[PDB]
Each structure stands twice: as structure tokens, then as C-alpha cells.
Amino acid sequence: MLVLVIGDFHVPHRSAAIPQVFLDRLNTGRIQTVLCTGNLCGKETYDILRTLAREVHVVKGAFDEMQGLNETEVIKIGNFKIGLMAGHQVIPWGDREALAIYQRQLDVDILITGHTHKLETKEVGGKYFLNPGSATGAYSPLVDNPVPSFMLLEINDSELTIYEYTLVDGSVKCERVDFNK
Template sequence: MSLAIMVIPWGDLDSLAMLRRQLDVDILVTGHTHQFTAYKHVGGMVINPGSATGAYSSMMDIDGLHLVVYVYELIDGEVKVDKIDFKKTSTSHSAH
């Protein structure tokens, strides 16, 4: 399911977290800022992949109640890989 909702100001973490709770989802994928961000925030996760074309690169691995986001950045000719873990707890919203 995809849904287009405008959040102003773009990329505002508190507004995105409120939208995530209103939609009753654990993970909200958002965009429009053209910058990669991933935050664990208020019992859930907000992810902006940065670009659908891969200009900024991240990969998501979802396994049941566990999400791992791998972030790849090219810095000074070296590939840097970061990993962000999110595991649903019993206090998180229901999975969709």
C-alpha cells in the first residue's frame, strides 16, 4: 500500500512520527528531502531513502519483527557501511 501525504515542514521528525502513529505503522518510509535519514523515534522508525534511483544508497532487510537498514556511503574513495537495527517491542504499534 502506498499513500501520498504531505508533511510540512518537509522531513520534520516529530511530524513524521505523529503521522506514523496516526497510520498505526511501525515503519514510515518518507521522502522529498533527497537526503538519506533513518531514525528510531518514539517506538518506531522513520526512513527516508534519499532517492529512489540510488543516488544515496541504503538497503533494508525485514525479517518478521526485525528490520535492519544498511547504509552505504562513499567517503574519500572508501565505502563506509553503517547498520541500523529496529526490533518491534510489545509496546510498538501493530505491523502492517
């Protein structure tokens, strides 16, 4: 049921740390599956994703030199087919129609991309487009003030619940989005 949607950890030549509050929340809550959009801070980040959940899925990010990571993956959870990728490849970058075209080629009910460094939950034509933001608040040319953020999905059968965690002004804030079928 519980799925961790995370990504965009590292930007080259820039340092950004995962908020300690996020790591404490994520290890105890028990995570069934992890979907990571990429751009990891090396092996240290992968060790963090591997301990919090048993099933980890990582896609190839633009700054990812890790060998063996596929650029696009498809995961089936409940009655939802989910495809994850970095999202720097969709052009013109975060475009609603560009992302919608990608969702068709994957034939997925949920499409998870992460390149804009801005968390966003959105529904288009019965499809769900998720973006967990940057969990380290990493620098991006697209957002002037990015905040650290992740997503935890509660997916049972065909019911989809999304918990949006962000860190604003040193204070965590979380928003719940409820979707059915």
C-alpha cells in the same frame, strides 16, 4: 526479508544518473520487495525497479506525472506495517513531529518518506522513520551537497536491520543499523 527502499531519482530540467555500482549491487542480491518514494526518470527508471525485484511499490512524487500512482501506500512485512510516501507533503518538511503525526494516521510501525534528499535512519518512541535519500544525488534546496544513496532492509519476523548505502567522493560507504522489535 530483503527490501529495497529507494526514490527521488529525477528533478525537472536536471540530469542525475544512478551510480553503476548501485545497479550492479541491486540486481544480483535478490530483493523481495521494493518501496520507492517517487520522482522517477520516466519509464526507464520503472524498468530498472521492475527487473531487480518481483514486488515493486511506487508512490506519487511531486515531480511525478505518471498516472495511477497512489500518494500513500501501506505494506506489511514480517511484524512491521510500513507506510511509504514522497514526503513533500509533510510540513514543515522533515519535521520530527510532522512525520510522527503522519505515522499515526497510517498506523504503521515504519514510515518511509523521501523529500529531503538526505538519507536518515531514526527511531522515535518505538517507531522507525526511514529516508533512503536520493539514489541519484539529485539536486535539492534542502541539502547543499547531496550524495547518491539507497537503503536495503533485512526484515525477518520482528528483527529489523537497515543497511545504509551512500556514495561519497566516488567511494561507496555503508552503515548498518540494528533494531529489535
